[PDB]
A and B are shown apart, each in its own frame.
With several copies, the nearest count.
Chain A
Amino acid sequence: QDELDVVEGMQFDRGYLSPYFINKPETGAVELESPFILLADKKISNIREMLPVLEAVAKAGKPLLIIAEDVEGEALATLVVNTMRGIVKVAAVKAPGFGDRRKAMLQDIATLTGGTVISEEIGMELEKATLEDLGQAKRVVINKDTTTIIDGVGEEAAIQGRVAQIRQQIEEATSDYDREKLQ
């Protein structure tokens, strides 16, 4: 039979970076209720850069989801230990897309969630990131393959402006595959 699968809001094909992040073992999916959103445009391997953000999140008490280029090594390990220890309910996922296009999706998620992307080019580093820098969303669901952000707490006007900008780029686009990607 022909089936129809409709996914609303934002959902990108990037699963959790560790199976230990799963909050709900019976479904195998991390479920974060009203979590902070940390959008990093650089690969993360140590915890020193991300430490103050973790302290601020733990003080707030809300969960955290880190959309990053890549989390691995010591930083992933300590995030895992902190997840089980209950100090911070934190999940880490890879940033969707590739070079010159991954940044676009990161900015889209930042606009949707009302956050800011951390990168070397923009100017600020992960050490100086604060709670206001982090994005906000009502719900976050991570599975083995896809991550969904439900009801991101972002300004509607900014979302519409970014959508209009992407539409303008689509009008400027001259490739079917590219225009489908921005669609």
Chain B
Amino acid sequence: NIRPLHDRVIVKRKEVETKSAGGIVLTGSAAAKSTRGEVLAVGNGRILENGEVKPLDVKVGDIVIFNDGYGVKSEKIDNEEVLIMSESDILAIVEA
């Protein structure tokens, strides 16, 4: 098990889209890495300057749209790829 620290979140990246809306298969650069992923683990929460801890708005097991960048790190757990990134990198959460 992996427990992220502070506001960091462990997210498993969704599979790359291999097909278009009408059935066109995308390959190479056409099938870019997905920016959405389900949340695998949520940290305790971001620590504020007053010493308190605020729980993250992301829960465990929800699909979130995040932003890839220098703040996102790649890791291998149970020989599967996961991403560790701050809660600020997550733009939104997919509902329904």
Do A's and B's CB atoms come within 8 Å in the complex? yes
Chain A to chain B contacts (Cβ below 8 Å), 21 pairs: A46-B29, A46-B30, A51-B20, A51-B24, A54-B22, A55-B23, A55-B24, A58-B22, A59-B22, A74-B27, A74-B28, A77-B27, A78-B26, A78-B28, A78-B30, A81-B27, A82-B25, A87-B23, A87-B25, A88-B24, A123-B27
Q: A interface vs B, CB < 8 Å? A: 46-48, 51, 54-55, 58-59, 74, 77-78, 81-82, 85, 87-88, 120, 123
**Contact B29–A74 (Cβ < 8 Å):** yes
Question: Closest residue of chain B to A45, judged by CB?
Answer: B29
The size bracket of the interface on B is 10 to 19
CB distance from B29 to the nearest CB of A (A): 5
Instruction: Note all chain A residues with C-beta closer than 8 A to B23.
Output: 55, 58, 87
Instruction: Note all chain B residues with C-beta closer than 8 A to A47.
Output: 24, 26, 30
Interface of A is mostly: helix
Instruction: Note all chain B residues with C-beta closer than 8 A to A77.
Output: 27-28
**Does B21 make an interface contact (CB < 8 A)?**
yes
Question: Closest residue of chain B to A80, judged by CB?
Answer: B27
Chain B 61-75, CB-CB to A under 8 Å as 1, else 0, gives 000000000000000
Instruction: Note all chain A residues with C-beta closer than 8 A to B20.
Output: 51, 54-55
Rounded to whole angstroms, the CA-CA distance of A74 and B53 in the bound complex is 46
**Contact A87–B24 (Cβ < 8 Å):** yes
CB distance from B40 to the nearest CB of A (A): 23
**Contact A78–B24 (Cβ < 8 Å):** yes
